[PDB]
Design a protein around this ligand. Structure first.
Ligand SMILES: CS(=O)(=O)c1ccccc1-c1ccc(NC(=O)c2cc(C(F)(F)F)nn2-c2cccc(CN)c2)c(F)c1
Ligand SMILES: [Ca+2]
Lengths: 52, 234
């Protein structure tokens, strides 16, 4: 199933390479060490509501 | 927006409002970055000279978090025509960079393939704006948001009196009286995935608003990602 299965456990973008899951993020986000989570680089990353 | 709810503090930070000479909103837009706004091409035909306001939620009181930005360059898709309303998309590069803060933030641009198989296959999306709250009414002074379910392409086409091209998609309700309306055009249609909102559409048109058997028509963002990218480098 890979990406077809819970988005391959990715926080955001998910594609398959070598029949394996590879996660990626939108600009302003850095891929975490686990290669799945997307971590913001600043106080206002794209796509996040501002609840402060 | 007909029906739906008021956008509470910080819930729709990527909403932008195009204001004319008289300082009144006539169309919406989406913040893509500190310098770029996404909107509808048909919104450009109105208002010879216009500005962009971000961070607003109540057009009446001057609140304090609002900010106006002049447009440096207007990038309208050349294939757009009032005769078909196809290619209803445009991008605005502002003179000065938007400063992000409470109620001011960009929506994420997704990847084509992923967006189509993961975002647009979602049950619903969210549309927002300061448009009319009824087909016959004035522009809303309060910013509203409305969750609109994705509509099957087949149902979409047969329900429409006009041709639904591949640069368009349906969202909304068959009979329930909630829909986007005049004035929301050019505004955001976002889809949430794990608490992150990605731009998926642009309020484009519809036969009236919240009419039974009719749906809201949006410009399909995934069909213009490359065009958007090229435009943001202009
Ligand atoms: C030019 S054509 O007809 O030959 C045409 C040609 C080819 C394809 C499509 C169209 C077409 C149809 C209706 C319209 N009319 C509207 O889109 C509209 C009117 C109103 C209000 F006046 F309020 F009734 N609100 N409104 C609208 C705006 C945004 C979203 C939604 C969603 N519910 C509705 C429009 F522009 C274009
Ligand atoms: Ca205001």
């Amino acid at each position: 199933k890979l990406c077809s299965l819970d988005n391959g456990d990715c926080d955001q973008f998910c594609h398959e390479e070598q029949n394996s899951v590879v996660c990626s993020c939108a600009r302003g986000y850095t891929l975490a060490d686990n290669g799945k989570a997307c971590i913001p680089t600043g106080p206002y990353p794209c796509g996040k509501q501002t609840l402060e | 927006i007909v029906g739906g709810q008021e956008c509470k503090d910080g819930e729709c930070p990527w909403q932008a409002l195009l204001i004319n000479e008289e300082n009144e909103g006539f169309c919406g837009g989406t913040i893509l970055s500190e310098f770029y706004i996404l909107t509808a091409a048909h919104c450009l035909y109105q208002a010879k000279r216009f500005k962009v306001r971000v961070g607003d939620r109540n057009t009446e009181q001057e609140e304090g978090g609002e900010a106006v930005h002049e447009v440096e360059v207007v990038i309208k898709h050349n294939r757009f025509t009032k005769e078909t309303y196809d290619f209803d998309i445009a991008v605005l590069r502002l003179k000065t960079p938007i400063t992000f803060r409470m109620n001011v933030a960009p929506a994420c641009l997704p990847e084509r393939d992923w967006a189509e198989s993961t975002l647009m296959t979602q049950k619903t999306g969210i549309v927002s704006g300061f448009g009319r709250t009824h087909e016959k009414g004035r522009q809303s002074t309060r910013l509203k948001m409305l969750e609109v379910p994705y509509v099957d392409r087949n149902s979409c086409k047969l329900s429409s009196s006009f041709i639904i091209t591949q640069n368009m998609f349906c969202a909304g309700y068959d009979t329930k009286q909630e829909d986007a309306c005049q004035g929301d055009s050019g505004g955001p249609h976002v889809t949430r995935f794990k608490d992150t909102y990605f731009v998926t559409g642009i309020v484009s048109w519809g036969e009236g608003c919240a009419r039974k058997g009719k749906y809201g028509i949006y410009t399909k963002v995934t069909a213009f990602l490359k065009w958007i990218d090229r435009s943001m480098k202009t």
